[PDB]
Design a protein around this ligand. Structure first.
Ligand SMILES: CC(C)CCC[C@@H](C)[C@H]1CC[C@H]2[C@@H]3CC=C4C[C@@H](O)CC[C@]4(C)[C@H]3CC[C@]12C
Ligand SMILES: CC(C)CCC[C@@H](C)[C@H]1CC[C@H]2[C@@H]3CC=C4C[C@@H](O)CC[C@]4(C)[C@H]3CC[C@]12C
Ligand SMILES: CC(C)CCC[C@@H](C)[C@H]1CC[C@H]2[C@@H]3CC=C4C[C@@H](O)CC[C@]4(C)[C@H]3CC[C@]12C
Ligand SMILES: CC(C)CCC[C@@H](C)[C@H]1CC[C@H]2[C@@H]3CC=C4C[C@@H](O)CC[C@]4(C)[C@H]3CC[C@]12C
Ligand SMILES: CC(C)CCC[C@@H](C)[C@H]1CC[C@H]2[C@@H]3CC=C4C[C@@H](O)CC[C@]4(C)[C@H]3CC[C@]12C
Ligand SMILES: CC(C)CCC[C@@H](C)[C@H]1CC[C@H]2[C@@H]3CC=C4C[C@@H](O)CC[C@]4(C)[C@H]3CC[C@]12C
Ligand SMILES: CC(C)CCC[C@@H](C)[C@H]1CC[C@H]2[C@@H]3CC=C4C[C@@H](O)CC[C@]4(C)[C@H]3CC[C@]12C
Ligand SMILES: CC(C)CCC[C@@H](C)[C@H]1CC[C@H]2[C@@H]3CC=C4C[C@@H](O)CC[C@]4(C)[C@H]3CC[C@]12C
Ligand SMILES: CC(C)CCC[C@@H](C)[C@H]1CC[C@H]2[C@@H]3CC=C4C[C@@H](O)CC[C@]4(C)[C@H]3CC[C@]12C
Ligand SMILES: CC(C)CCC[C@@H](C)[C@H]1CC[C@H]2[C@@H]3CC=C4C[C@@H](O)CC[C@]4(C)[C@H]3CC[C@]12C
Ligand SMILES: CCCN(CCc1cccs1)[C@H]1CCc2c(O)cccc2C1
Ligand SMILES: CCCCCCCCCCCCCCCC(=O)O
Lengths: 338, 238, 57, 279
């Protein structure tokens, strides 16, 4: 018989529901009461990067805060100079159905993948200058949902096969896999130290992983529905999430629970993407509402809106130095804001 | 202008990349993208092989080029994914059509195919995508009816009520039982498709066997009708 | 059948996630307060820099 | 006094309506990158520019002369005859170009998606304006059109020839193109109706939408222009009709210019952008 394991699991959950309530001496909304709110964040479009044919489905900033990758389902990955709006590279992908791209912290490599189940790594700084595939990381049994480089020889990927994996780029194989999620793993973000990462999935949960122990360390469950986006708060001790729930939620790695929730009665559609400003003070979120809301991260007031898109906001990223946010969309344009 | 040799090289590089993008935009308009769907029994695998006269295995999508009357089609078969469709399907918000394949000979499986069609048809992200139905293995449907086994009513009790549309066009020498059966199952997908979507998308049924060399011609004819109805709606003539 | 090992591995995960040490929500929130107030002076989306400093003008 | 005030009010209202409607079309396109990306809008804005020129360049001065009973703007009368012939012709030729775009799209759907571009749209518009400029300006400046008051009377050869190019050829093209569109729409409606009927039968009028849309498009265009263009041929050939009757049918031709933005630009994508701009 199995049921002793179900009894043990249920009592372990009962213990941790109680342990989280024993930590719940306050709320962020209570201790925030004396904080002076942010002014109305009247940001405006400073560039419009145009040239993609289809819907833009992902983007990522370089650590230099100049360069951008973005990917669209016409099968181009384009590299842009954000200051001059020059196209530095345009890369023909072998499959059209790209769903993620990422750009190395050195600027040497870009990665992307999607419905082909493969992560393709491109070397930008090859001798002949004409860019080409370095390696293809085959081994996931479902489409790639996210990619992040830890360094020029380590990448973490998440997949529709319900797993994450860590790879060695020189070997071209998985050196760890992460398997506690159920349903499709949607989104993924490294901690600032790159020793932890979080992932969110269609099980309506987020999980915290150690990169080298290879195991889940905490699980978070506050969403009533499917999680599309996740991001670390800049201190590394907390993270935000966004979902088909029409809510953002913020969690802390030591309180082990929802610390805050962001919602308004005017919004009922899914959240596609999230990010923080450099101090963590603002949470920026993209929607199926064709626009981005900007939230006071401590108060959960809407501090502003970015309204410049004609179709679903697919991706959103603040620069590594905080000097801008770029937002992509199914309208095929990238807009940069201050 | 104020360009250094470096800024000149960056602008020249940009204009060369823009020249390449502007050329590839012609190819992207000159081709039609099709998503091919259907269960394990459907025979979609034999349809796609038989189309290649018009032209790693663990990868999560397969692609087939074909052309008819100098129009290009790219047909995508999603395979080696998990069975939960609800997320990856959002990529196909902008295909010309979905091709949906059914094994008409499996009365046990046919309600799964109707449920699978219903969740495709009513999907939030597919509100403007028309479906081409291939009601496949019509030879095996003829065999299972002509064998006299007389059992469709065990699965579908309205087949005791149903009688053939006067709009029906049976082929020469087709039996009235075979004809009543093939039009009955067709009209179940018409029951689903005509109930929703207010002329923003349409369903195009065909009776077929996977060996039909006519299947690429059927896709061409329906894509032509799909684009005509789409233009006719912009001008409020539908 | 293999469901015994699946339920057993789940109980090991729930043990490991139960055994982790935890902190009062008041202290956790106060760390986010301290980090925001320390860095808000240097976060250019809150307080716009002039077009001479901004590469995006 | 009373008829002077009444006509001043009515002509002012008609000018302002024509000005506002065509301004809204120009206001919508400039702010909307998706509207600019859809090729068909290049024609709809070109129509609205033609109709905006009728409102600014032509109608106001004739309205002043009608309330006054005399023409004050003497050297301008020769220029005004060119402005009128050009922007009146441009408005008709823009409608004819819109019919050929709609017919190409419906008739040859793959070849349209492949070969239609912002360059192709701009060439079609550029030829409509070019032909309206050439017919008006070269004949008026060469004094080929003529055989205080403004002499708008015409030479017999120029009146007939100008009516063929500006109206009778473009209405023949609009009749052929919209007739073939009606036949293609009837084929698709029979197919749809068959599958709907089979679904209702198994579970156990749309042609009027096509007729309404095409009868508004052809009905408004032919009603306003056809009375004027028939008189425009008769009157110089007879040198047969009272000048008051001629002036009312002239005002019907420009009245079509006010209806043009209602018929062509009230579609839901424009209608959203109007609501979004206006708040
Ligand atoms: C004095 C006469 C000739 C002026 C006639 C007005 C013409 C020049 C106007 C009317 C509508 C206009 C077009 C409206 C929309 C677009 C789409 C945009 O993506 C490029 C410019 C383009 C193609 C415009 C170019 C100029 C245009 C064609
Ligand atoms: C695109 C549109 C808005 C341009 C309009 C330009 C107009 C105002 C210009 C173009 C040609 C001009 C006319 C050309 C010749 C003459 C004859 C002269 O003895 C009196 C002025 C008069 C009558 C001009 C008045 C102004 C005029 C009508
Ligand atoms: C006397 C007047 C009405 C003659 C002008 C007729 C009108 C309808 C003209 C104006 C611009 C013309 C178009 C200009 C360019 C092209 C592209 C070519 O590849 C096919 C024909 C096509 C599409 C032309 C068809 C006729 C056309 C639409
Ligand atoms: C741009 C083109 C295609 C437009 C058509 C121009 C037509 C209307 C032109 C071309 C040649 C012209 C004729 C040339 C010469 C004369 C002699 C003059 O004493 C009276 C007018 C008359 C008889 C002209 C009438 C108008 C005319 C027929
Ligand atoms: C392009 C084709 C289909 C157009 C066919 C109709 C044309 C040719 C018709 C329509 C109106 C007609 C004119 C109407 C009135 C008159 C006055 C009469 O005393 C002599 C003939 C004359 C001058 C006609 C000539 C032919 C005409 C211009
Ligand atoms: C005076 C009257 C009777 C003349 C009628 C002329 C008609 C038949 C002409 C005018 C403009 C023409 C169209 C202009 C452009 C194209 C695009 C081309 O790729 C295929 C033919 C097609 C679609 C033409 C078909 C014939 C057409 C509609
Ligand atoms: C010189 C001009 C003003 C003459 C106008 C004659 C018009 C009204 C005539 C000429 C050709 C006619 C069309 C010829 C064919 C058809 C197809 C039929 O299934 C419905 C009626 C319809 C669409 C006719 C309607 C009336 C019609 C458009
Ligand atoms: C006063 C000036 C502007 C002339 C206006 C005339 C217009 C309003 C007339 C001319 C022809 C008419 C159309 C002729 C035929 C039909 C088909 C019928 O089933 C519904 C009405 C409808 C669609 C009419 C609506 C009004 C109409 C479009
Ligand atoms: C409205 C559209 C569809 C049809 C137009 C039909 C044309 C032929 C009709 C409409 C109004 C008519 C005119 C009305 C009044 C007069 C005054 C009379 O002393 C001579 C005939 C004359 C000048 C008519 C000639 C024919 C005419 C121009
Ligand atoms: C639906 C809208 C566009 C219909 C517009 C109707 C227009 C054509 C009507 C309304 C009032 C009319 C005017 C009323 C009185 C006069 C005085 C007369 O001595 C000459 C004609 C003139 C100046 C008329 C011309 C036609 C006119 C401007
Ligand atoms: C609405 C009609 C405006 N005008 C009429 C000008 C007037 C004459 C008498 C009183 S006011 C015509 C003149 C002739 C012509 C033409 O040959 C070809 C294309 C357009 C036009 C426009
Ligand atoms: C924008 C305010 C109202 C319109 C004022 C200008 C009217 C005359 C010129 C209109 C045509 C030129 C603009 C076409 C659109 C474009 O170039 O993008």
């Amino acid at each position: 018989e199995l049921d002793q394991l179900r009894q043990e699991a249920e009592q372990l959950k009962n213990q941790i529901r109680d342990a989280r309530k024993a930590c719940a001496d306050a709320t962020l909304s209570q201790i925030t009461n004396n904080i002076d709110p942010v002014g109305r964040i009247q940001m405006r479009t400073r560039r419009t990067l145009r040239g993609h044919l289809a819907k833009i489905y992902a983007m990522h900033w370089g650590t230099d805060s100049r360069l951008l990758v973005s990917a669209s389902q016409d099968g181009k990955l384009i590299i842009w100079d954000s200051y001059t709006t020059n196209k530095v590279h345009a890369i023909p992908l072998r499959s059209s159905w790209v769903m993620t791209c990422a750009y190395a912290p050195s600027g040497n490599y870009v990665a992307c993948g999607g419905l082909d189940n493969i992560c393709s790594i491109y070397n930008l700084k090859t001798r002949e200058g004409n860019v080409r595939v370095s390696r293809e990381l085959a081994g996931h049994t479902g489409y790639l949902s996210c990619c992040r480089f830890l360094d020029d020889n380590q990448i973490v990927t998440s997949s529709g096969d319900t797993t994450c994996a860590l790879w060695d780029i020189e070997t071209g194989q998985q050196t760890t896999t992460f398997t506690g999620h159920t349903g499709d793993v949607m989104s993924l973000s490294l901690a600032p130290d790159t020793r932890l990462f979080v992932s969110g999935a269609c099980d309506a949960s987020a999980k915290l992983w150690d990169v080298r122990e290879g195991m889940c360390r905490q699980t978070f469950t506050g969403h009533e529905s499917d999680i599309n986006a996740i991001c670390f708060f800049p201190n590394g001790n907390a993270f935000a999430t966004g979902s088909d729930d029409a809510t953002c939620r913020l969690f802390d790695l030591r309180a082990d629970q929802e610390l805050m929730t962001y919602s308004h009665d005017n919004i009922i559609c899914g959240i596609t993407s999230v990010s923080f400003s450099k101090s963590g003070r603002l949470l920026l979120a993209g929607y199926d509402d064709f626009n981005c809301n900007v939230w006071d991260a401590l108060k959960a007031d809407r501090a502003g809106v970015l309204a410049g898109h004609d179709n679903r906001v697919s991706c959103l990223g603040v620069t590594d130095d905080g000097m801008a946010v770029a937002t992509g969309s199914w309208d095929s344009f990238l807009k940069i804001w201050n | 202008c104020t360009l250094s040799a470096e800024d000149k090289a960056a602008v020249e590089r940009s204009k060369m990349i823009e020249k390449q993008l502007q050329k590839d935009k012609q190819v992207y308009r000159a081709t039609h993208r099709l998503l091919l769907l259907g269960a394990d029994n459907s025979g979609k695998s034999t349809i796609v092989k038989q189309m290649r006269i018009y032209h790693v295995k663990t990868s999560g999508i397969f692609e087939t080029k074909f052309q008819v009357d100098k129009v290009n089609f790219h047909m995508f078969d999603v395979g080696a994914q998990r069975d939960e469709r609800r997320k990856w399907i959002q990529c196909f918000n902008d295909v010309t059509a979905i091709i949906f394949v059914v094994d008409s000979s499996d009365y046990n499986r046919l309600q799964e195919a109707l449920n699978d069609f219903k969740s495709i048809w009513n999907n939030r992200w597919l509100r403007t995508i028309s479906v081409i139905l291939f009601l496949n293995k019509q030879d095996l449907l003829a065999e299972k009816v002509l064998a006299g086994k007389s059992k469709i009513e065990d699965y579908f009790p309205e087949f005791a009520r149903y009688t053939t549309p006067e709009d029906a066009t049976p082929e020469p020498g087709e039996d009235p039982r075979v004809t009543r059966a093939k039009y009955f199952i067709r009209d179940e997908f018409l029951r689903i498709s005509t109930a929703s979507g207010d002329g923003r998308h349409y369903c195009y049924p065909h009776f077929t066997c996977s060996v039909d060399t006519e299947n690429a011609r059927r896709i061409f004819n329906d894509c032509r009708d799909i684009i005509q109805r789409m233009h006719l709606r912009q001008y409020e003539l539908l | 059948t293999a469901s015994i090992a699946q339920a057993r591995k789940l109980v090991e995960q729930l043990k490991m996630e139960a055994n982790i040490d935890r902190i009062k929500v008041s202290k956790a929130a106060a760390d986010l307060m301290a980090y925001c107030e320390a860095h808000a002076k240097e976060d250019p989306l809150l307080t716009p820099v002039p077009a001479s400093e901004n590469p995006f003008r | 006094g009373p008829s002077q005030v009444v006509t001043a009010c009515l002509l002012t209202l008609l000018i302002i309506w024509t000005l506002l409607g065509n301004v809204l079309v120009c206001a919508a396109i400039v702010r909307s990158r998706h509207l600019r990306a859809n090729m068909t809008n290049v024609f709809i804005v070109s129509l609205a520019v033609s109709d905006l020129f009728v409102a600014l360049l032509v109608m106001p001065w004739k309205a002043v002369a009608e309330v006054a009973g005399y023409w004050p703007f003497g050297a301008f009368c020769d220029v005004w005859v060119a402005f009128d012939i050009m922007c009146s012709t441009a408005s008709i030729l823009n409608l004819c170009v819109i019919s050929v775009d709609r017919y190409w799209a419906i008739s040859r759907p793959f070849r349209y998606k492949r070969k239609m571009t912002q360059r192709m749209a701009l060439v079609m518009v550029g030829l409509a304006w070019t032909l309206s400029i050439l017919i008006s300006f070269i004949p008026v400046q060469l004094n080929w059109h003529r055989d205080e008051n403004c002499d708008s009377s015409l030479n017999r050869t120029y009146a007939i020839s100008s009516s063929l190019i500006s109206f009778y050829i473009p209405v023949a093209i609009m009749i052929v193109t919209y007739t073939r569109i009606y036949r293609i729409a009837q084929v698709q409606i029979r197919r749809i109706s068959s599958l709907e009927r089979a679904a209702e039968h198994a579970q156990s009028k749309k042609e009027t939408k096509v007729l309404k849309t095409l009868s508004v498009i052809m009905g408004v265009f032919v009603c306003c222009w056809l009375p004027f263009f028939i008189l425009n041929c008769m009157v110089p050939f007879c040198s047969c009709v009272s000048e008051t009757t001629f002036d009312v049918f002239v005002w019907f031709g420009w009245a079509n210019s006010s209806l043009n933005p209602v018929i062509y630009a009230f579609n839901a994508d424009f209608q959203k952008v109007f609501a979004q701009l206006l708040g």
